[PDB]
Amino acid sequence: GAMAPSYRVKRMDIAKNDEECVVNAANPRGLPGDGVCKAVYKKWPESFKNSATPVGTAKTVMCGTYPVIHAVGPNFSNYTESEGDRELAAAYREVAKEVTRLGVNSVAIPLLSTGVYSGGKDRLTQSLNHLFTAMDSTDADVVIYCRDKEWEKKISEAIQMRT
Numbered sequence: 001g002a003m004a005p006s007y008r009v010k011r012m013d014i015a016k017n018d019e020e021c022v023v024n025a026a027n028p029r030g031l032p033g034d035g036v037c038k039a040v041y042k043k044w045p046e047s048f049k050n051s052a053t054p055v056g057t058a059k060t061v062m063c064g065t066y067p068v069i070h071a072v073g074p075n076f077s078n079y080t081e082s083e084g085d086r087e088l089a090a091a092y093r094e095v096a097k098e099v100t101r102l103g104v105n106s107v108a109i110p111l112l113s114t115g116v117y118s119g120g121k122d123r124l125t126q127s128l129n130h131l132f133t134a135m136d137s138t139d140a141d142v143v144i145y146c147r148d149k150e151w152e153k154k155i156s157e158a159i160q161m162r163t
């Protein structure tokens with residue numbers, strides 16, 4: 001475990017993370033995809049061997065000894081708000097199981113279903129709250145990665161409001 005488990009947020013490419021493992025915002029078919037998924041495919045392409053997994057699940061594949069946790073959030077274009085909310089919560093619970101099983105002291109994680117799977121809606125708070133619900137019982141240092149300047153400020157505020 002980390003000596004004093006924390007949450008932090010950084011605005012940069014998660015392919016440049018300084019953590020012991022990464023969470024990919026994966027598609028169910030293990031395809032290169034776009035956004036975070038394409039950055040992860042360029043950096044860790046070996047981790048896409050048999051990475052296909054259903055919505056609401058996570059599947060870990062090693063790139064060398066570096067673990068890539070492929071977490072499949074729902075595409076809110078296809079799911080109802082109710083069913084999508086359930087699957088987005090479930091993907092983060094499976095990430096927390098994998099992080100615990102791997103015994104890592106730190107993990108880099110993006111906000112699932114906030115980009116091209118958002119169905120055109122701002123889901124920062126919904127996705128971050130499901131991240132906290134799953135990760136709060138883990139003792140890894142969690143570093144959340146984002147690309148937008150306003151999102152960085154809002155994620156940092158949400159972390160600080162609970163400390």
Ligand SMILES: [Cl-]
Pocket residue numbers: 011012013016
């Ligand atoms: Cl960058």
Ligand SMILES: [Cl-]
Pocket residue numbers: 025112113114115116117118
């Ligand atoms: Cl997304």
Ligand SMILES: [Cl-]
Pocket residue numbers: 146147148151
């Ligand atoms: Cl972002």
